[PDB]
Amino acid sequence: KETAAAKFERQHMDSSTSAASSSNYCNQMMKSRNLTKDRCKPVNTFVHESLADVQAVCSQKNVACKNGQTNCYQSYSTMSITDCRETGSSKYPNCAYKTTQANKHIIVACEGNPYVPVHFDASV
Ligand SMILES: Cc1cn([C@H]2C[C@H](O)[C@@H](CN3CCCCC3)O2)c(=O)[nH]c1=O
Numbered sequence: 172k173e174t175a176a177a178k179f180e181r182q183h184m185d186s187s188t189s190a191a192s193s194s195n196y197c198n199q200m201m202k203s204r205n206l207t208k209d210r211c212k213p214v215n216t217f218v219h220e221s222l223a224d225v226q227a228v229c230s231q232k233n234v235a236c237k238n239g240q241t242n243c244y245q246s247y248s249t250m251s252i253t254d255c256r257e258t259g260s261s262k263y264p265n266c267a268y269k270t271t272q273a274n275k276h277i278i279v280a281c282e283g284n285p286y287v288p289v290h291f292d293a294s295v
Pocket residue numbers: 214215216291292293294
């Protein structure tokens with residue numbers, strides 16, 4: 172079974188491209204990472220940095236999570252990310268996404284021993 176840490180890697184980690192994220196990127200990635208099976212997941216972010224660099228965020232700037240929990244952390248440096256957002260014309264099972272590349276600070280929720288990212292909260 173998939174651990175919370177593994178689910179985070181599946182949903183949010185893409186170290187393979189630095190930031191080319193073609194116009195096709197989100198359409199392909201949302202599908203391949205199995206985020207279009209139950210429904211079209213409406214919003215998702217992929218981070219183009221090393222797993223070590225993202226895991227390190229759990230020891231960086233402690234900030235409140237959107238849900239009010241205290242276990243969120245903001246990266247000290249900007250990171251290469253791609254936001255995927257479902258279009259209006261997207262109809263399941265043909266999930267369609269707008270691909271947006273940017274360089275922003277990420278905010279992740281961390282849990283466990285080892286203390287690792289388990290949720291992507293925001294980018295700022
Ligand atoms: C704001 C933001 C959210 N997400 C993901 C994390 C959760 O799976 C989901 C949380 N949230 C649920 C309610 C509002 C829309 C999104 O979206 C994401 O992947 N990147 C983001 O920048």
